[PDB]
Symmetry: none
Amino acid sequence: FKAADLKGIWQLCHYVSESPDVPGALKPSNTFKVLSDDGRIVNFTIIPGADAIITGYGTYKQLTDDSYKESIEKNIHLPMLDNQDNILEFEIKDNDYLHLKYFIKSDLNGNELNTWYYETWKRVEMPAKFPEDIVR
Amino acid sequence: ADLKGIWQLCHYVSESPDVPGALKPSNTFKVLSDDGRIVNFTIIPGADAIITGYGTYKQLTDDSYKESIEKNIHLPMLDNQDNILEFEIKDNDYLHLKYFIKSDLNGNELNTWYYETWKRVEMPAKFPEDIVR
Amino acid sequence: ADLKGIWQLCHYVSESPDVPGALKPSNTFKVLSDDGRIVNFTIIPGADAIITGYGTYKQLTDDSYKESIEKNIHLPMLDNQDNILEFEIKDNDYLHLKYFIKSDLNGNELNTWYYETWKRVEMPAKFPEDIVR
Amino acid sequence: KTKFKAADLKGIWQLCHYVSESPDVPGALKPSNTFKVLSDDGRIVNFTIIPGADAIITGYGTYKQLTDDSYKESIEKNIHLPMLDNQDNILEFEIKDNDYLHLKYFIKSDLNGNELNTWYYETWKRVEMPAKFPEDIVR
């Protein structure tokens, strides 16, 4: 296969809605995934007005056209992935949205979970101009 | 009925557009004062919060109250009108409301029921550590 | 002075200790009602907002008002006390306050001035597009 | 002679700014909205989170440590400081207590040719993994 455009900085998004039945509108959130050029992965979450925190790190590698592996060293968000390979099924839609899914068999307590997790991330890009009235 | 207080609008948050969202507290507040005033306002992250509606209110029956709206920038068709809201407070903490809007701002037939869930804002026993005031 | 309203806590922020800063709105609100009630509350993103203090208030002079605090989880030393706040409203929108606490909860001498800056929450001309309520 | 024990530049750094409760009170150093990613493979990316909107990349390029107290950013594009586009910026630095990156750099002139001759100072804090994931946090 030819490498998908995974490398970059990705921003976690969620879907907000007025009813539980209507599909939500996409909104960018506080978590970032840095997929480096040398195969390193770092997840971190900003805490407004406080220190941001690293929540997971390791290495990554694309396996197929629609799957990549994160070889997680430590993950405080999902401790069951520590020293494990997590296979993420993915699709990049319109060059900017990374739609991923992964499966967790058992939780940190050892109980059967058998749950698929879904995430949407948006590629962080440089705009044409630096916006006025922004707090760096 | 225990309507007086500060209420926080809830919305539905999901990880995917296909998975049903979980009910979560959101950015909008309804202040139902002890002296019969109503104010709706919405916080805007990184900017000034905004008042979106105000007027007076009064409970009419066991399951209905009236908001006599002066101005409402969220729903301009309610300006200078009485809105009758059907309500139920479940478990002392959740205000479930429904109201009907006949027409939109242009006068076109809407005939839509709006449903809202608000959660009572309370004082907890202790001030939590590591929150940004 | 026009004390009545909803006030939003601000911080003064600069990129350097030498460059003059700017006021930036935060997560805390003070509701100074028309009937003399005061409520402080803080939004916690993704969780329930919390009431952190309440009581009554009354203007005393042109540049001072009193908060008769019943309970305050943020500042417990003000419980069942009158706090006299020196204030100035600059350009109708910014409430600059200062108050003095003589002693801590243990009765030890504190003799400390506390400063706060709040911005008046207003209704804008139009409801902005693409905000999350 | 312990230069191998020197603090790493590599990592994710968070820009600090000065915040107080009032303009009459001097601001305390606090973490802000801007991040510098100094990768293991010599890439630099500056980006700023914008509450309620998409975060934005504000500068990128490559970097390399030159001496014990200086490193170079070979900037491709920088929307925050456009005069650094396609230039090398030499940053004098010191890492204090492993966690604070104190840097300074000099800008001779702006894009318009206005002689500036100004030193810029920045403080960044190393972003780390805490022992436990905190409970009431928004991802």
